[PDB]
Amino acid sequence: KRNKPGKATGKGKPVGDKWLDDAGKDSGAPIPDRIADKLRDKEFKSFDDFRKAVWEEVSKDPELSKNLNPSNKSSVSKGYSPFTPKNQQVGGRKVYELHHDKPISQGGEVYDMDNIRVTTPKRHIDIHRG
Amino acid sequence: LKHSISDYTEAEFLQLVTTICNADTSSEEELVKLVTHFEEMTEHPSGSALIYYPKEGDDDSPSGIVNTVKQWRAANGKSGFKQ
Ligand SMILES: [Zn+2]
């Protein structure tokens, strides 16, 4: 289902400067409302294509991008996920990861931004653990 | 050629750091490979933070990063760059 086309939906939430700090805690950080406004109703061939669009929009957003350093700004400008702080990295997983709150395996929506969270590798592994 | 710091001249190492800082790759995978390589080369306890999460006061230009690495290795009993 991650590789079937869908249009992006949902509202997201207001965020601040600590947006990506929240990705290491609880259920992760929300998709920002400002990002949801840009991506709603666009069609994506796959979830990977959506992921790329998220980071490109972050690169272009003057409130979200200001809290990334020059090297991380370069990364998001390419549509790559930015690098997390070292202690949130796990092996070769060193960048922020998108997470579905209601699992896709359980009929969770792939492209509904209200069902998506931004996580660090460490937090993402821990959420799925059980 | 790229097995250790001592295999790189300072100029060659600056080229590597510049490529990383500019995300001058064809994929996210390629960039992650380069950052991992940097971490393994420098042996600096901060790892990727030298590039992405600089300590207050540190110069996070490519030149600044190279000098932070060079100074740390010099102060901590490690071998230096080639020439
Ligand atoms: Zn997940």
Q: Mind listing the domains of chain B with CATH numbers?
A: 1-83 (1.10.1200.20)
The answer to whether A61 touches A35, Cβ cutoff 8 Å, is yes
Interface membership of A21 toward B (CB under 8 Å): no
* Residue range(s) defining the domain that contains residue A99: 1-130
Lookup: tokens for B58: 């540190």
CA angle, residues A115, A118, A120, in degrees to nearest 5:
140
Question: Which residue in chain B has the smallest CA separation from A76?
Answer: B23
Sign of CA dihedral A100, A101, A107, A109: negative
CATH of the domain at A79: 3.90.540.10
The answer to whether A61 touches A88, Cβ cutoff 8 Å, is no
CA dist A122 and A64 (Å) reads 22
Name residue, tokens 């971490």: B39
Amino acid at A2: R
Cβ atoms within 10 Å, residue B21: 22
Method: X-ray
Report CB contact under 8 Å: B22, A74.
Answer: yes
Q: What is the DSSP string of chain A?
A: -TTS-EE-B---B---TTGGGGGGSTT-EEPBHHHHHHHTT-EESSHHHHHHHHHHHHHH-TTTGGGS-HHHHHHHHTTPPPBPPGGG-BTTB-B-EEEESS-GGGT--SSBGGGEEEE-HHHHHHHH--
In chain A, the number of structural domains is: 1
Question: Which residue in chain A has the smallest CA separation from B44?
Answer: A86
Interface membership of A70 toward B (CB under 8 Å): yes
Inter-CA distances, B13 with A68, A109, B17, B37, Å = 24, 45, 6, 11
Question: Which residue in chain B has the smallest CA separation from A93?
Answer: B32
All residues with CB under 5 Å from ion ligand 1: A 99
Interface membership of A52 toward B (CB under 8 Å): no
End-to-end Cα, chain A, rounded Å? 24
- Strands across the sheet containing A116-119: A29-30, A116-119, A97-100
A99 appears as a binding residue in the annotation = yes
Report chain B residues whose CB lies below 8 A from the CB of A24: none
Report CB contact under 8 Å: B32, A95.
Answer: yes
Q: Which of A102, A124, A126 is nearest to A114 (CA)?
A: A102
